[PDB]
Write a protein that binds this DNA or RNA. Sequence first.
RNA 1: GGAGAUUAUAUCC
RNA 2: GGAUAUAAU
Length: 672
Amino acid sequence: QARARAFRLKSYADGDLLRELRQFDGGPRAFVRDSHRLDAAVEKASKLTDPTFHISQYQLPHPYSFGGGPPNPERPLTAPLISAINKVSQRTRDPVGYRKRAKESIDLGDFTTHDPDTLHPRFLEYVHERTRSVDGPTDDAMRAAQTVFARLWRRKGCKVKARSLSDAQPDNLLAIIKKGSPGEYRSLGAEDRRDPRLIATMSSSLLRYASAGVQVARGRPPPGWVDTTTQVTLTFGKREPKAAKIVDGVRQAPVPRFIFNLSPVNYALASFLHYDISHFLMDNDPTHGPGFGPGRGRARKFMDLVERAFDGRFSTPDGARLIMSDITKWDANMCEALIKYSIDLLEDAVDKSALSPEGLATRGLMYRVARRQLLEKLVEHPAGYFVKLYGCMPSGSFYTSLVNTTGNNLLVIGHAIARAVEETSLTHHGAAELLADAVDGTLISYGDNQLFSEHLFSVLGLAYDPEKHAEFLARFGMKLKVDETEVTVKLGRVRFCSRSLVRTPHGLLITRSHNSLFAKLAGRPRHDPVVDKLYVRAMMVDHMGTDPIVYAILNEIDRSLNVSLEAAGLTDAAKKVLEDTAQSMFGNREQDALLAVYRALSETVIDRRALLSLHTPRDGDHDPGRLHTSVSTGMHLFTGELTPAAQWAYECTVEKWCQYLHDTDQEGVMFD
RNA sequence: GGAGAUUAUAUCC
RNA sequence: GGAUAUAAU
């Protein structure tokens, strides 16, 4: 409707549409339309009964996709990291073992960029059989699992109410629209989702449901646009560090993740319907990961689960294990059946009882559209052409974390219920009432990342069984990697969102594995040398100074970068990352202030105390203390009190650390 | 040719 | 009311 109107091709089958597309095919990072990027996907889909993907009959004269290419090939941190590991490993208990374990990770360190010619093979992961619905036994279990969380949410105080359309007015809609992508409106001049003309368009796209609902509440049929309104979804490849893996010998360089950039109109509908229920779960649902962070008291849902399972010890007091589910490529494989159970449960938690009959019908039409649009997407493939995608989670939707987390939680509870009805004398209702009590404190998911206590199965009179867990997931087309799913009784192997917990004599302390740091460093492409030096310090911040080996290694790398730090001169990249420092030290961001900061940078050290202050919560019992440049350019001194356990970690040398982890059996935190 | 959502945190305005 | 940066999913 905006001059970009699509034309209809003549064919119907994918193989014939593909031939038709050649007639539109077109530096090395400008976009060129290329229908051959679809060849393998079309070939794969042709052998499937119910494929997740078809070529769209409708196409645009001009595509939205942009070109790309490979990153800078140099890896400037690999050599300094090796010297640092060479030195610090000598102060650990097994120096040659540490250096070998660490070399494995450095070798895998890599990096992905957006490039249409490397992105299209990743899309094959999204091309497989649909699972529209599951069989009777599984459905009964999944609907019982829905009652578990619905009960949990009510007990936790859920009082979320349906919004009125007053909140779809431009001035009120702003409070539930975050800044970000204009999606397909970027072609029309919009730069941000929160731009006033976009906000006006998103508002109109919500208010149009009012009169549609008036008709349905009178028993008339809905307007036609309700069932046909669609928005284009754009795609691109993720730019990030990513570790290669060794699969059957060959070291497999990483394929870029497939990212979806959804339309602001779809965003506005999702947020109008479900912003509140999402924020209620973040604040109050103990199984809901989103809201988590590693510092400042934000890991409490993780720590509460661990402390219920370990009660002060380093191994679980009973033998009850902890399970960390390892699922292959969650977003590509989340089927329509699981998406429906998840979003339906979320919509059910929203209280509609105060709505008028028109208001209720209006919300029903809005939900109808949001559900259909989560399930069936119109996606511009990196070939430069539209395809239709049924199921899969479109990573980048408003619903991504919310629905992935809800679905993973429903999987394990549905599985538990399914086993109980088959194997024991519990009914669906009876298993549900047990799990509703036991799930509070025994389960947490963050999308496909999951951690749960075997007590979920204990209270059903069952023991966890990974093959039965994998078989349940396979009913939804998902592959639980059984040999990579950690099952343990030891705190040192418990993980959540890439974080470990170390129990010190004064309490728990979030930490991170060393191998993850080494791969990221080995994968870092060459930037401006000041930018890269500040990246190494950002890594210190990410690790929060808990581990003195990690601090030592990073402090070594930081020093080593000083030899060549000034070789590029004061570039614009270096100016940008030094601006905050120049204004806090000299009052201005002018050339001389910036160069004074620049030339002093070689003289700075990042204080481990500043890093460990990040464990301090902002509690009204704790004042964490301002950091200024303490963890970036290092030109302020951090004054402030650490938490007891973090104070213990400051007083703790490489040598004391390895001894304590050895004596407590917590050395699992270092690797994996 | 000049790269999504969500969460957490830090810095500066 | 905004900007920049890193991490996680």
